[PDB]
Enzyme design. Structure first.
Site, PDB file in Angstrom:
ATOM      1  N   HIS A  43      31.565  50.541  33.340  1.00 21.49           N
ATOM      2  CA  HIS A  43      31.284  49.394  34.180  1.00 21.49           C
ATOM      3  C   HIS A  43      32.158  49.577  35.373  1.00 21.49           C
ATOM      4  CE1 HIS A  43      30.672  45.386  35.698  1.00 21.49           C
ATOM      5  NE2 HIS A  43      31.968  45.070  35.526  1.00 21.49           N
ATOM      6  N   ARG A  73      38.587  48.751  39.512  1.00 25.13           N
ATOM      7  CA  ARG A  73      38.927  48.118  38.232  1.00 25.13           C
ATOM      8  C   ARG A  73      39.882  48.969  37.379  1.00 25.13           C
ATOM      9  NH1 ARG A  73      33.427  47.625  39.353  1.00 25.13           N
ATOM     10  NH2 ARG A  73      32.365  45.699  38.891  1.00 25.13           N
ATOM     11  N   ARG A 116      21.819  43.552  37.049  1.00 23.91           N
ATOM     12  CA  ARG A 116      21.778  43.759  38.498  1.00 23.91           C
ATOM     13  C   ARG A 116      20.710  44.743  38.875  1.00 23.91           C
ATOM     14  NH1 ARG A 116      28.331  43.367  38.923  1.00 23.91           N
ATOM     15  NH2 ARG A 116      28.421  41.339  39.950  1.00 23.91           N
ATOM     16  N   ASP A 137      25.647  45.264  34.853  1.00 22.45           N
ATOM     17  CA  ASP A 137      25.129  46.301  35.730  1.00 22.45           C
ATOM     18  C   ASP A 137      23.626  46.513  35.524  1.00 22.45           C
ATOM     19  OD1 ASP A 137      27.893  47.642  36.767  1.00 22.45           O
ATOM     20  OD2 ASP A 137      28.069  47.264  34.602  1.00 22.45           O
TER      21      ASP A 137
HETATM   22  C1  LIG Z   1      50.252  36.860  28.462  1.00 20.04           C
HETATM   23  C2  LIG Z   1      49.072  36.215  29.111  1.00 20.04           C
HETATM   24  N1  LIG Z   1      48.180  35.510  28.456  1.00 20.04           N
HETATM   25  C3  LIG Z   1      47.194  35.037  29.322  1.00 20.04           C
HETATM   26  C4  LIG Z   1      46.094  34.257  28.971  1.00 20.04           C
HETATM   27  C5  LIG Z   1      45.189  33.869  29.940  1.00 20.04           C
HETATM   28  C6  LIG Z   1      45.364  34.240  31.266  1.00 20.04           C
HETATM   29  N2  LIG Z   1      44.408  33.817  32.219  1.00 20.04           N
HETATM   30  C7  LIG Z   1      43.931  34.528  33.262  1.00 20.04           C
HETATM   31  O1  LIG Z   1      44.313  35.662  33.539  1.00 20.04           O
HETATM   32  C8  LIG Z   1      42.870  33.821  34.077  1.00 20.04           C
HETATM   33  C9  LIG Z   1      42.664  34.462  35.429  1.00 20.04           C
HETATM   34  N3  LIG Z   1      42.071  35.791  35.330  1.00 20.04           N
HETATM   35  C10 LIG Z   1      40.762  36.020  35.343  1.00 20.04           C
HETATM   36  O2  LIG Z   1      39.927  35.121  35.371  1.00 20.04           O
HETATM   37  C11 LIG Z   1      40.352  37.475  35.342  1.00 20.04           C
HETATM   38  C12 LIG Z   1      38.855  37.725  35.403  1.00 20.04           C
HETATM   39  C13 LIG Z   1      38.482  39.192  35.265  1.00 20.04           C
HETATM   40  C14 LIG Z   1      37.063  39.581  35.609  1.00 20.04           C
HETATM   41  C15 LIG Z   1      36.508  39.227  36.826  1.00 20.04           C
HETATM   42  C16 LIG Z   1      35.213  39.583  37.148  1.00 20.04           C
HETATM   43  C17 LIG Z   1      34.430  40.296  36.258  1.00 20.04           C
HETATM   44  C18 LIG Z   1      33.027  40.693  36.631  1.00 20.04           C
HETATM   45  C19 LIG Z   1      32.976  41.533  37.922  1.00 20.04           C
HETATM   46  C20 LIG Z   1      33.801  42.798  37.803  1.00 20.04           C
HETATM   47  O3  LIG Z   1      33.568  43.529  36.749  1.00 20.04           O
HETATM   48  O4  LIG Z   1      34.631  43.064  38.655  1.00 20.04           O
HETATM   49  C21 LIG Z   1      31.551  41.816  38.373  1.00 20.04           C
HETATM   50  O5  LIG Z   1      31.130  43.046  38.276  1.00 20.04           O
HETATM   51  O6  LIG Z   1      30.867  40.899  38.796  1.00 20.04           O
HETATM   52  C22 LIG Z   1      34.980  40.646  35.038  1.00 20.04           C
HETATM   53  C23 LIG Z   1      36.279  40.292  34.719  1.00 20.04           C
HETATM   54  C24 LIG Z   1      46.454  35.022  31.633  1.00 20.04           C
HETATM   55  C25 LIG Z   1      47.354  35.411  30.655  1.00 20.04           C
HETATM   56  S1  LIG Z   1      48.802  36.361  30.815  1.00 20.04           S
END
Ligand SMILES: Cc1nc2ccc(NC(=O)CCNC(=O)CCCc3ccc(CC(C(=O)O)C(=O)O)cc3)cc2s1
Ligand SMILES: Cc1nc2ccc(NC(=O)CCNC(=O)CCCc3ccc(CC(C(=O)O)C(=O)O)cc3)cc2s1
Ligand SMILES: Cc1nc2ccc(NC(=O)CCNC(=O)CCCc3ccc(CC(C(=O)O)C(=O)O)cc3)cc2s1
Ligand SMILES: Cc1nc2ccc(NC(=O)CCNC(=O)CCCc3ccc(CC(C(=O)O)C(=O)O)cc3)cc2s1
Lengths: 329, 329, 331, 329
Positions: free
Chosen positions: B190, B103, B166, B163
């Site tokens: 995290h 991350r 979990r 965490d």
């Molecule tokens: C200028 C701009 N404005 C915008 C506005 C909106 C968007 N929109 C998106 O980016 C949507 C797509 N992106 C995601 O959904 C990212 C999710 C991140 C994530 C995934 C898993 C976990 C939990 C996980 C772990 O921590 O890994 C665990 O432990 O389970 C935590 C966080 C892009 C832009 S660009």
């Protein structure tokens, strides 16, 4: 001794009592899963699919959330032995339609899948209610009925519950009233031949057709007929925009699950057999309002339809019966 | 007259009281949304993203299930004017790690993104609480703090709430106890350098370290240290299996939102500034247990840590400050 | 045909057995607080109420029935005959005398033992596989009596015990610390009454031992007088009775809490009355509150809380007190 | 340092955001209180009465159950300053009728009480919604309205919400359907002159009067008129049996509180001014279906009534106006 034993003295020495199984961990399956988990309907949730990595991953992801839920056991497997003793088994497996594809075109693909799934569901949970979500849901509810051997009260198709929810949402936006206080049914096929029941539409008992007699005609200057067109076209507008639908159907299925698990005897428009009603003489399944509880569909409401409304339902039945002729199992 | 006017007599021509915004409609942001819609925490939900078709599709799918929810207004928009007057704005936008990618390696990609997002959120809801979920959430919470100009209390990282959940899940499986009744804190990053507080682990107030002194060491015949290792590797195991994670982080975020919206003053382990504590002397953000309510983090619990538990937290602080100090914004 | 038959076509005129039925015995303020609590937590598909005063009973049933539009429990029934309790998963006993201002709970023994001699065998006849949840006082002793009279195994006879005492403890802990009782942990064990034992050694927020931060905690030299918090737990029912005449809401919620863990099989840990023969040097069939794991089979396990020598001393005292009164029983 | 300071570091040392005050801690007040606490409608609950020991005792009892609720602040007092910044204040104070005594006979006693209560509530929450439950509710809503100076959308009487609920329960018993799926409105006075709107009675949009034209007449072989008689006699029969009523009204009032606090815009039969409708020319308050949300009554549904249904309602209106016109304050 172990830590567990130093800490805990065991008295004993149990079968689940409110178990729900969801077959299919696609987006629809997992929306159903999450919705049910957050409405506390189950003491055990079981998930089944054929892709083992995806399945385990889903199970694990919900599991990690257990602290925040009140469902103490979450299991998954390709093997249906994990579904044993379910009260409700929700079938979300199968092919789903592309942009410009009819739900009716999914029939041979999904019928073939059902020939494997349904006998396995029945094997481990012979007293369950079977809630069919897979499409075409009206034919697949008939198919699940003939395959499972269940009496028809325990085979329920999600049908037009979501169509009616959609209709009521749009009705609400037009009137400035929560959809809960807006009433109106879309019956028949969950699909292009669905019938809006203009004669039953109301707020606080006040018939909308009574106030606005053009309601449902082409002459109508407010064009209410376009609200039903939007209901017919919703799944396609959403598929066109995000590639699939998930959340509404999941909520609609949790809504139905709630009425079954808690034996509420709420009325929902769900797929069941309507032979004998409205001049239909064949074993067609489609949606009419039904009384939902712990034995599934205990009763049907015999909605009164204008002749135009009844002719459309009968045309929906005829269309569904035609596709039903294609069935081999 | 119109049907609306025949039916409805209007007294009032005349802003949401409990509005929540989710930025990002990826799997994580929509799991945040659904969980919040089903816990009734909001009187309006706003969604934002940069991909217009997917956004609209998501909004509509939710809207069509409004009959089954108690959140009367759902809105979306590329334009942040849809988010005005939010009480709580949850950031889930950004790049996510690949299998085998920390991350921490997402930092500059998601800092870039925050330079657009954060001032636009702040513009339209200057009095909101910012709940940061995007990763690396500890450093991004710090970045959200610097970009927004909000006081500490209103910038909250989802942190180790997940965490710890979990952890408690895995603890419960071993002990045959619901995770609600299993207690144990995972603190710091995290991520890979998260610190399990073995000294705090208990059921019914009983110290498991005292019952089982090998607890949290590699010599332990029961291998409790592996429970933490399963917490560190959880996200990667689920990513390997299903491609992403969603449901657990959704639920964890709705847990935090619940405490903020209802002003509960419950204690969660969430990302905040820990300068001054355990000999950390820089503006490092990481998870310690905090009291959450309507002003965000109103207080920190100063957890007592064995010298090793403290050494591990100082190590997590260092790793973070290493990355943190090489940022420009 | 009738209006019903014109509107509705029937597939089944055939009922199942109750699937998630709860009975509450006694419709006094406690009984009805249990009932309303259970109703709004959606724990049952069927609620049965029993009492011996017929007008009070019918009126309570009707009042609940009138709110059905706002509830999700479709069947609410009542009767003096126990045939309305048939097939209950969980039977909650709130029946009996309650203590006046200044009266010990232990003074209710003979009156409520006699009542239970009628109640318990009636409940067992119509729901032989139910869990019994005893709320009436003295709850530790009446749980033993329910146990001996019913013939049930001890996992299915649960006393409401110190779940409420512990909930009060946590609330007061919360007011002193500025934290929700949910995030305050602390256990009051032993008798639901004057001899209950506050377990200072397990008191914690976020796994931080309060005893460790404040070594005088629970001693008389304690400058912050935390001992007074336990005293307030002990005196709570009395200060409330003194002010409004009885208590209802807090005990109602406590019981609903327990019902929830039983009905949904949560295996959460609650301080409830169960038999502790073989623990802490107790060698008789004493019932009292220790932390028990609660699920669909009632109490499946016991947490063996580690106690300082003083804390164990007080618990063994609490046990001896209750064993004393247990000798007052005749069947 | 104290234990609290060794344990907790404070960041931050605000107004009430979702506060509900209940005035009167008799059986109805407390049934309102418990109902609202268990539905999570408030972040602060205040109780007010004149009997200081009863008041303190009820507060304490609620407080001791805090571990099981999600409403973090519970306060009470004789002085109305405990009620400050309430969004919603529910008046349940007053004399209640004996068995065989009309609620209309309470008017002078409860009007006199309101002369003290209403200006005190208004001083400390000038922007609140007033939900009057005390009887005769329709008259006392009018009185609250005149005393307070509030605009009429912010003064709501519980009116016939309970009557209609009773109606729907009874209907549901006869038909074998959950009351949620049974629809029918009782309008006018909350008391002997209430009007059952037979023309609006329906299941699934099917008009019961269309099916069974004797519905609501004395001839009727099925005696549906007796369903209304049972609605009218309900408070009297419950009073006779258990000595008061509490639970059904408590739930009803929470149902209303729910629509206000969550801004749902559902439709409820509640007391409001109806001058200009059904040929009423006086400032009569009584129940008609109104849209309820965060500004109280924003809209009225103008129900279509049969000539007899309208006659009955005009008769309800006259009975109350006959009492209203006499009062002075
Ligand atoms: C200028 C701009 N404005 C915008 C506005 C909106 C968007 N929109 C998106 O980016 C949507 C797509 N992106 C995601 O959904 C990212 C999710 C991140 C994530 C995934 C898993 C976990 C939990 C996980 C772990 O921590 O890994 C665990 O432990 O389970 C935590 C966080 C892009 C832009 S660009
Ligand atoms: C032998 C075998 N055993 C198994 C076992 C499991 C699986 N698993 C899967 O097949 C998982 C993937 N499949 C899906 O998720 C299909 C979802 C169908 C769907 C989509 C949308 C809507 C609602 C929508 C509309 O009605 O169009 C609207 O109206 O919004 C309804 C239904 C395959 C096999 S093969
Ligand atoms: C042969 C027969 N069959 C029946 C069947 C029914 C009935 N019915 C009644 O007797 C109804 C009236 N009885 C009560 O309601 C007694 C409630 C006891 C209570 C009070 C307070 C607390 C909590 C409190 C504390 O524990 O002190 C605290 O700590 O707050 C706990 C328990 C009589 C008979 S006779
Ligand atoms: C200057 C002063 N300030 C105060 C402040 C507080 C108080 N406190 C009290 O007066 C407390 C006692 N009062 C009650 O509880 C009255 C309840 C009214 C009620 C009863 C039943 C129903 C529903 C029912 C039906 O409508 O009959 C049905 O239909 O079921 C509705 C309403 C006195 C004063 S004096």
């Amino acid at each position: 001794a172990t830590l567990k034993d130093q800490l805990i003295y065991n008295l004993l020495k149990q079968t689940p009592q409110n178990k729900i199984t969801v077959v299919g961990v696609g987006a629809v399956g997992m929306a159903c899963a999450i919705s049910i988990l957050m409405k506390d309907l189950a003491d055990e949730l079981a998930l089944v699919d054929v892709i083992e990595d995806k399945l385990k991953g889903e199970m694990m992801d919900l599991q990690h959330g257990s602290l925040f839920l009140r469902t103490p056991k979450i299991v998954s497997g390709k093997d249906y032995n994990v579904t044993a003793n379910s009260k409700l088994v929700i079938i979300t497996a199968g092919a789903r339609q592309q942009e410009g594809e009819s739900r009716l075109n999914l029939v041979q693909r999904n019928v073939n899948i059902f020939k494997f799934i349904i006998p396995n569901v029945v094997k481990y949970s012979p007293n369950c209610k079977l809630l069919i979500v897979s499409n075409p849901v009206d034919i697949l509810t008939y198919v699940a009925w003939k395959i499972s051997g269940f009496p028809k009260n325990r085979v329920i198709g999600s049908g037009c519950n979501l169509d009616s929810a959609r209709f009521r949402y749009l009705m609400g936006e037009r009137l400035g009233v929560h959809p809960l206080s807006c009433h109106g049914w879309v019956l028949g096929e969950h699909g292009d031949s669905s019938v809006p029941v203009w004669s039953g539409m109301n707020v606080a008992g006040v018939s909308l057709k009574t106030l606005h007699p053009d309601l449902g005609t082409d002459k109508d200057k407010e064009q209410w007929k376009e609200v039903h067109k939007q209901v017919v076209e919703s799944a396609y507008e959403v598929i066109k925009l995000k590639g699939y639908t998930s959340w509404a159907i999941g909520l609609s299925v949790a809504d139905l699950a709630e009425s079954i698990m808690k034996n509420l005897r709420r009325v929902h428009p769900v797929s069941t057999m309507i032979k004998g009603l409205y001049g239909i003489k064949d074993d067609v399944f489609l949606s009419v309002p039904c009384i939902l509880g712990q034995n599934g569909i205990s009763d049907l409401v015999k909605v009164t339809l204008t002749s135009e409304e009844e002719a459309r339902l009968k045309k929906s039945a005829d269309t569904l019966w035609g596709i039903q002729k294609e069935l081999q199992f």
